[PDB]
């Protein structure tokens, strides 16, 4: 079961949520693999990977090396596949390397058939790049990460997202009147909304600074318990594959 | 002068600050034009533009129309130029339209040389597309919008900032250990920091719902006065036309 997590908008918390969902799924006793499809290569930092460690699947392919040799093991049941540190030229010229890396989509089809992992989470960036659409077509199910604000409200009315994808609220605050009005309206208007949300928790801001998933950094944190609920919801509702 | 605003990542608050700084400059009596270079086309919505209104400078160029006829007048001294509503096919296929928007560079430098506008603000997105690199090159000065978190702290090291840019802090919560630690590290490591910052304020979240700039929504709000201080700082430091 390959699950794709993508933000409706940048900076809503996709990287921290995928790392936490991975930890929560392996804690439930599932074999998980996590891949980082964002050029920012931030997912590796939630697993105590040295910032100077430039290896990754996208960096291995663009350097001619094998992508399978860029893996890192976190626990007996959690495997990590970083994106790789890009050059300054590659950051400023995304078009040159944008379409040289469709081999990973074929390589993920092997893993999906390998049976080694029950879950393969994909940290998807907020763009319409080709590799992102190719990877999104492999996922059996999809999550869309939002924040309760006017930016996401507008994006939910003008931006299309994958069919069957569900909406996961993150960074839900307490006390904001405009958030209460948007949220109360969402509960009656948004039909793709998930039955659980993720509150704003200082643990979510600290865990990245501590280079640990939020379920490992502070297991009794409210966000850690809400993401753990999400992990069980994935086991209940996102277990079946797409044809 | 021509002042560009670009977030270090998404969701940092570039659009809301760009609208608020434009309103603050027109309140100071300066002829200002503000243009939206993000394909999201979210800057128009801070000026009571009806959401169905699809017209915009990019919408005009792709349809073979005059982009100058896509302008809108908000006040006597504040004009705006939206990006335009892309269809679902167009936004999911950015390769189709990215290289077909270079005409805005010549028109921007003509508008620049005209002398009608004393400030031209450009809301730049996070992508490294050819158009956004071109518009960034035509700017006189630039602001890099950040939020004090571990995400922006990583990017500030692995992401090249434009030359001579200045970093602006938004969404500043008081009462967070990790944020205060990242801040105190920035105070002695970031020489490009500004002498002011924009606190997290409910007005900045409500104004977009009200489809107004924050200065017009609540002139008494702390964030509104902080951005007004930014406008006065721009008058004192960014008015030159560096060639």
């Amino acid at each position: 079961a390959v699950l794709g997590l993508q933000g409706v908008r940048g900076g809503v918390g996709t990287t921290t949520i995928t790392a936490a969902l991975a930890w929560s799924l392996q804690m439930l006793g599932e074999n998980v693999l996590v891949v980082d499809a964002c050029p920012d290569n931030l997912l590796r930092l939630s697993f105590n990977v040295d910032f100077t460690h430039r290896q990754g699947w996208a960096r291995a392919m663009l350097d001619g090396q094998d992508w399978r040799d860029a893996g890192l093991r976190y626990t007996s049941q959690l495997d990590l596949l970083p994106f790789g540190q890009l050059s300054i030229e590659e950051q400023e010229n995304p078009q040159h390397w944008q379409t040289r890396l469709s081999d990973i989509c074929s390589g993920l089809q092997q893993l999906k058939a390998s049976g080694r992992y029950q879950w393969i989470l994909i940290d998807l960036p907020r763009d319409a790049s080709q590799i992102t659409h190719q990877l999104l077509s492999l996922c059996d199910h999809s999550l869309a990460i939002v924040n309760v604000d006017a930016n996401c409200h507008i994006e939910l009315h003008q931006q299309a997202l994958p069919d069957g994808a569900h909406i996961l609220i993150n960074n839900f605050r307490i006390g904001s009147q405009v958030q209460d009005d948007i949220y109360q309206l969402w509960l009656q208007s948004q039909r793709r909304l998930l039955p659980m949300l993720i509150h704003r928790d200082e643990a979510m801001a600290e865990c990245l600074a501590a280079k640990q998933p939020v379920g490992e950094y502070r297991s009794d944190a409210l966000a850690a318990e809400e993401i753990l609920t999400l992990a069980n919801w994935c086991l209940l509702n996102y277990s079946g594959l797409k044809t | 002068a021509v002042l560009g605003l670009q977030g270090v990542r998404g969701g940092v608050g570039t659009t809301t600050i760009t609208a608020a700084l434009a309103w603050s400059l027109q309140m100071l009596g300066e002829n200002v034009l503000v243009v939206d270079a993000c394909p999201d086309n979210l800057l128009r919505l801070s000026f009571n533009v009806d959401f169905t209104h699809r017209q915009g400078w990019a919408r005009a160029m792709l349809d073979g129309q005059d982009w100058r006829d896509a302008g809108l007048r908000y006040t006597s001294q504040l004009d705006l130029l939206p990006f335009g509503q892309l269809s679902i096919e167009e936004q999911e296929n950015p390769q189709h339209w990215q290289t077909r928007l270079s005409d805005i560079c010549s028109g921007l430098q003509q508008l620049k040389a005209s002398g009608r506008y004393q400030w031209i603000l450009i809301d730049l997105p996070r992508d490294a597309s050819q158009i956004t690199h071109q518009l960034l090159s035509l700017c006189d000065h630039s602001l890099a919008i950040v939020n004090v978190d571990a995400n922006c702290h990583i990017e500030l090291h692995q992401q090249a900032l434009p030359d001579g840019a200045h970093i602006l802090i938004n969404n500043f919560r008081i009462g967070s250990q990790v944020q205060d630690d990242i801040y105190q590290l920035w105070l002695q490591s970031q020489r490009r920091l500004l002498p002011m910052l924009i606190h997290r304020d409910e007005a900045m979240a409500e104004c977009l719902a009200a489809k107004q700039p924050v200065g017009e929504y609540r002139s008494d709000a702390l964030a509104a006065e902080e951005i007004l201080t930014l406008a006065n700082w721009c008058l004192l430091n960014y008015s030159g036309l560096k060639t």
């Binding site: 006017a150 507008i154 405009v178 009005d181 109360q184 309206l185 | 919505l45 009571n48």
Partner: peptide, 22 residues
């Protein structure tokens, strides 16, 4: 009173009404 609260929220925020009154 939940029907009342939604009505006031649309009146308070034009952006919400703009999408709900289409």
């Amino acid at each position: 009173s939940q029907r009342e609260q939604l009505a006031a929220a649309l009146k308070r925020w034009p952006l919400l009404a703009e999408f709900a009154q289409q």
